[PDB]
From Swiss-Prot:
The keyword 4Fe-4S does not apply. It comes from Escherichia coli (strain K12). The record marks E126, R144 as: Substrate binding. This is Lactose permease. The gene is lacY. The lineage of its organism: Bacteria, Pseudomonadati, Pseudomonadota, Gammaproteobacteria, Enterobacterales. Residues 35-41, 101-104, 164-166, 250-253, 309-311, 375-377 are periplasmic. InterPro entries: LacY/RafB_perm_fam (IPR000576), LacY/RafB_perm_fam_CS (IPR018457), MFS_dom (IPR020846), MFS_trans_sf (IPR036259).
């Protein structure tokens, strides 16, 4: 219909679709790539990943602030497709070497740029396309749902095709990407048609600063939210970032190990939907403060649930749990801010609580972990994380902010209205 007939919807609705392919392959492929293909150790991964964060810390913000000065100008988005496109050449020829010839520290730092095109770029493409939705009429609401397919599909084809010829996967990741990427730029949207002239008129913006900041640190709830996020995402994320290779110990063969993974991730998002569809009700019904906990608990159990694991089928069950925590954390982390936080603070919150304060820890924990793995084995270290994990989730229960602060209904009218 009008949301399926128009130029831009189709065009970008695709752009979404083919982002995930490349992301798809990229993410899982990565750990596995390193292993089977780059005989990578923990020290190396640990840093590889961790490092990545640094640029997920120092690259993305400047990159989102540039999104405004740019307004709805495609300039930067191209700077994305550009670097994405040499995905195959870059990876095969750059990391491989810097790494394989025996020179790790540089292959990481120096590789976490075409590599940045998938952390910031996400909120990137997720953003721009969003402003284009306000210009045409149909919400990124159905654009992400359309683009998410590519994620499902790719992953599957990833495992399969991967082991058969990883050299290949990149080819089709970066190929369909580029070709279609550029294909989708020649057809765009430039000027208004009743949708206001100035870029500062339709999407509007938000702001942050020292006082805002200086005020947040004054608050105690930041301290107690951060602990949560920081403690628990750091932990959990580090875990999931190298959890794969472990999953891959459990199979008849490496070739089939990999496969299952693609299946899972893929079969996952279909669980993602089912959940989130209820997420809001569930949450509201429940409560921010709770949403998170339940989320963190799960995670804990998904970790501790790995030091006591032996079967491959038993790992299947442990992954799944990933998708149980997604919705709830996103949703909760989101509605808990809005619920115990003055709206003028969101932007600052993310910036300070999730961009300068999350990403930071990972750079450290990751390495800690990597090391713990090499020097103590997967499951062994886990008791450390998962424990710490649950230990921090527990404290949050007994210490996060009131499920119903000193005026829940009044502000719960604030979220509704
Ligand atoms: O990274 C691709 C996936 O991103 C998440 S949202 C994203 O998740 C990472 C962990 O991978 C961090 O928590 C970030 O802060 C967060 O923004 C989506 O939900 C998935 O479907 C993938 O698109």
């Amino acid at each position: 219909m009008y949301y399926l007939k128009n130029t831009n919807f189709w065009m970008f609705g695709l752009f979404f679709f083919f982002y995930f392919f490349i992301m798809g392959a990229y993410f899982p492929f990565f750990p596995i790539w390193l292993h089977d293909i780059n005989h990578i150790s923990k020290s190396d991964t640990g840093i590889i990943f961790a490092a990545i964060s640094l640029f997920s810390l120092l690259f993305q913000p400047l990159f989102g602030l540039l999104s405004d000065k740019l307004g709805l100008r495609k300039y930067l988005l191209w700077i994305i497709t550009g670097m994405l496109v040499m995905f195959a050449p870059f990876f095969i020829f750059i990391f491989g070497p810097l790494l394989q010839y025996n020179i790790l520290v540089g292959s990481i730092v120096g590789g976490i740029y075409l590599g940045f095109c998938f952390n910031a770029g996400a909120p990137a493409v997720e953003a721009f396309i969003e402003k284009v939705s306000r210009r045409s009429n149909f919400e990124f609401g159905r654009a992400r749902m359309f683009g998410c397919v590519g994620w499902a599909l790719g992953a599957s084809i990833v495992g399969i095709m991967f082991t058969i010829n990883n050299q290949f996967v990149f080819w089709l990741g970066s190929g369909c990407a580029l070709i279609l990427a550029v294909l989708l730029f020649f057809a765009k949207t430039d000027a208004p048609s009743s949708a206001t002239v100035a870029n500062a008129v339709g999407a509007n913006h938000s702001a942050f600063s020292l006082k805002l900041a200086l005020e947040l640190f004054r608050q105690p709830k930041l301290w107690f939210l951060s602990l949560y996020v920081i403690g628990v995402s750091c932990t959990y994320d580090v875990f999931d970032q190298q959890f794969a290779n472990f999953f891959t110990s459990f199979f008849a063969t490496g070739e089939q190990g990999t496969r299952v993974f693609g299946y899972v991730t893929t079969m996952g998002e279909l669980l993602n939907a089912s959940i989130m569809f209820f997420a809001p009700l569930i949450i509201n019904r429940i409560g921010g403060k709770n949403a998170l906990l339940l989320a963190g608990t799960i995670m804990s159990v998904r970790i501790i649930g790995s030091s006591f694991a032996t079967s491959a089928l038993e790992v299947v069950i442990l992954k799944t749990l990933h998708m149980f925590e997604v919705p709830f954390l996103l949703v909760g982390c989101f509605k808990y801010i809005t619920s115990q936080f003055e709206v003028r603070f969101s932007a600052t919150i993310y910036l300070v609580c999730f961009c300068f304060f999350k990403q930071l820890a990972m750079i450290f924990m990751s390495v800690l972990a990597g090391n713990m793995y090499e020097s103590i084995g997967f499951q062994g270290a886990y008791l450390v994380l998962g424990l710490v994990a649950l230990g921090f989730t527990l404290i949050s229960v007994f210490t996060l902010s009131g499920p119903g602060p000193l005026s829940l209904l009044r502000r719960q009218v604030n979220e509704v209205a």
